[PDB]
Amino acid sequence: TTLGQSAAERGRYFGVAIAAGRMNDGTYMGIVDREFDSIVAENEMKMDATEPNRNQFNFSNGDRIVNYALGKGKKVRGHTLAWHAQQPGWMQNMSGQSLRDALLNHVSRVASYYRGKIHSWDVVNEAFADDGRGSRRDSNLQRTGNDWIEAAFRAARSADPGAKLCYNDYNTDGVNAKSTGVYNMVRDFKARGVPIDCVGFQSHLGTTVPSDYQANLQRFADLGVDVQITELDIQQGSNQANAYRQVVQACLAVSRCTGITVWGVRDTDSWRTGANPLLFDGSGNKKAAYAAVLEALNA
């Protein structure tokens, strides 16, 4: 088997983040053809990639990833319709109502273009502080109004109602002040019928999985949302393979945990240079962490 085969047999997907740049690399494209049944774009679908100038869109590189995914029978995750980081320059300098207008225009148009091709959308990415109080990150977006996360989900449901609408964030893997700030927002969203289907957990780990990784996953699924591990990577070390095997078993244990996406093919492809935090090495070979993931999917 492969990761994707044996994660399907558990009712789940195993995805990978790819970059257009590498799609000519023969051994890279091979591993992706075979091991994963879900695909994210690493950069080609962010705000600056898709709307370089106000109200004017280029989906050229994002499409090369999406259409490769559909052509080979794989699911597609959309990353990401709204995010303080990596805003096209014209957007960084707007504020207020017109920023709010520009933001919703971005979400409905991007989600419209990809309607029917997107298994799930990171609608809003990283909206909570890392300050031990679970408060909102101060952003030009957040300064338009505390309800901008709601408005963004509303615009995305309109544009593509078949897509699963996710909130995605990092430093949210255990039970901390940040996951509980996310939790309270989502709870209120589900209370009020705000259209949010899944919560994403980036899980950019150090060397070790939190004791309550699954307890935190589970408290969210109990809200009646799906949970997804969206951008997984684990710092290398002797506990690396143990840490991957634990993340997979925490997802199999939770019934609403639909799948896991690691954030790159090979160690050399990682935004986290030097960490070697992935399932393959630069020579393209399976690491120990690959065998841990494949067993955990099978045991």
Side-chain angles (χ1 to χ4, degrees), residues 2-294:
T2 55
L3 299 184
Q5 285 187 1
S6 83
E9 282 151 44
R10 299 293 211 110
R12 290 165 172 91
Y13 66 82
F14 212 89
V16 67
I18 72 188
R22 331 176 166 282
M23 270 150 91
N24 277 327
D25 178 320
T27 131
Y28 177 89
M29 285 315 279
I31 293 150
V32 190
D33 288 355
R34 313 156 271 193
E35 303 283 348
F36 305 92
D37 50 6
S38 177
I39 305 276
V40 221
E42 195 190 319
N43 278 274
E44 297 70 1
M45 268 163 254
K46 303 176 169 161
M47 312 190 81
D48 58 15
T50 56
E51 194 180 350
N53 317 277
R54 177 158 200 184
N55 204 31
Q56 268 138 27
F57 293 83
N58 178 256
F59 304 103
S60 157
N61 285 5
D63 293 342
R64 282 210 276 107
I65 290 171
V66 168
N67 289 313
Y68 163 86
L70 302 174
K72 303 251 162 97
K74 298 154 157 27
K75 267 146 282 222
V76 178
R77 316 198 62 254
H79 183 76
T80 166
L81 301 171
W83 192 19
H84 71 294
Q86 304 191 229
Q87 291 183 23
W90 66 266
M91 189 176 286
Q92 274 143 13
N93 274 130
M94 300 188 60
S95 82
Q97 250 293 30
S98 35
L99 175 59
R100 167 74 60 113
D101 289 345
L103 169 65
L104 309 162
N105 189 46
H106 185 76
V107 182
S108 48
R109 265 286 249 163
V110 181
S112 289
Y113 186 83
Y114 287 106
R115 173 177 176 149
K117 318 199 238 154
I118 295 302
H119 180 261
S120 24
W121 268 111
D122 293 336
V123 187
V124 167
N125 199 36
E126 313 167 350
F128 277 84
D130 301 316
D131 71 350
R133 281 180 198 170
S135 41
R136 290 285 183 82
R137 167 193 307 278
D138 179 14
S139 36
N140 59 345
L141 301 171
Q142 166 72 14
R143 300 185 228 108
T144 73
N146 196 78
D147 62 356
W148 73 274
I149 303 179
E150 183 166 329
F153 276 99
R154 290 187 57 203
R157 173 81 86 213
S158 303
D160 183 352
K164 283 149 203 307
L165 307 189
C166 296
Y167 178 82
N168 195 52
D169 218 327
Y170 66 90
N171 284 3
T172 43
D173 309 308
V175 180
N176 38 60
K178 195 176 188 193
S179 77
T180 298
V182 177
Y183 181 91
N184 293 336
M185 178 187 70
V186 178
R187 195 229 279 205
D188 165 78
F189 280 6
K190 296 299 274 213
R192 289 185 298 106
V194 166
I196 169 150
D197 314 324
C198 38
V199 173
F201 295 90
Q202 287 176 27
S203 301
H204 290 293
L205 300 188
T207 58
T208 178
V209 178
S211 323
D212 46 2
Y213 188 78
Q214 180 193 294
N216 187 66
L217 290 193
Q218 183 55 266
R219 71 162 163 173
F220 277 94
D222 286 9
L223 284 188
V225 296
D226 301 329
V227 297
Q228 296 180 358
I229 294 143
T230 49
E231 317 177 14
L232 176 65
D233 37 33
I234 296 157
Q235 182 157 358
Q236 73 186 328
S238 46
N239 191 56
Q240 192 187 63
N242 218 283
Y244 272 110
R245 171 194 66 68
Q246 280 166 316
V247 163
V248 174
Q249 283 168 0
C251 179
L252 297 168
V254 185
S255 78
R256 272 233 204 203
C257 178
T258 66
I260 318 172
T261 303
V262 304
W263 198 244
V265 181
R266 300 175 294 201
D267 280 328
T268 47
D269 295 321
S270 175
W271 72 306
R272 278 173 51 172
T273 67
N276 299 316
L278 292 188
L279 311 184
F280 295 81
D281 66 354
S283 296
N285 292 122
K286 293 163 181 181
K287 295 169 61 159
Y290 177 93
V293 167
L294 203 89

